[PDB]
Amino acid sequence: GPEYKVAILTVSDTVSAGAGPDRSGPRAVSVVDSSSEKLGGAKVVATAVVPDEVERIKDILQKWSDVDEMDLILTLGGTGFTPRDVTPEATKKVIERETPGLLFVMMQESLKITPFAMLSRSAAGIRGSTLIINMPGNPNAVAECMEALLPALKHALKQI
Template sequence: MWRIGILTASDKGARGEREDRSGQAIREFLSPIGGQVVCYEVVSDDPARIRDALIRFSDREKVDLILTTGGTGLAPRDVTPEATRAVIRREVPGIAEAMRLASLEKTKFAMLSRGVAGIRGSTLIINLPGSPKAVRECLEAVSPVLSHALETLKGTFGDHD
């Protein structure tokens, strides 16, 4: 069972003015891949708060996978990719590319998504868009490789034949 952290970046969500439907969409998606949510937080679109939560989930809570939602667009307060880059050691660009490509098949606006994916220690971090529909589309695009990625990251996957 994979230990999962969900981090929602939303000013309105952090103030209790908006229900976190994107975080709920992530939760609904995790059961089939054997994920258990052990950390969940809604933070404002503040780089320091996002960085702190990512570090805490990864380093203290030892989650295997952090899925963020929100803050990946072009608005001035959309800073999730920058906060993520500040804490990861290596990027995994193919994940973000695959999500954008899958989303582009549905909407031209997908090219405006700036989400990234990367590794901190033994934790994989993936930025998802802020809408529940986009969250589901992106997770569908990457779900076939998530277990393999996490097994490889943990050193539990065998040799490639």
């Protein structure tokens, strides 16, 4: 129906505990929708929240790739230098083929906005036929990151 199935995983002790809301989730979802055309037609069909714990992250990534077979998973948060940030360690354990080019573009564009970009430790890669991309928690982040990738993500999903 929707061709490319996207899922978004918000990572955040605060949100997961119900101690605060998700401000970045909704922004991402909406960027994806707004980019559907240029993405080759894609839609978000699922979101979830988990705390900052690797096992918790690992599971969802496994589930959504092996069982639900999503095409594109974006994670938000837990990619910084704080000790609780372990999204990338969780992500590196489940991908099979790395995609450094994506990381390279995300790091290049974001460094044009600000140097603090050097603090993302985002990972990315493919598992089965799911592309997974770690992104930062800021609400505007997703917007800028997606702008950077959109010129090729289409061909990227097709090739998978």
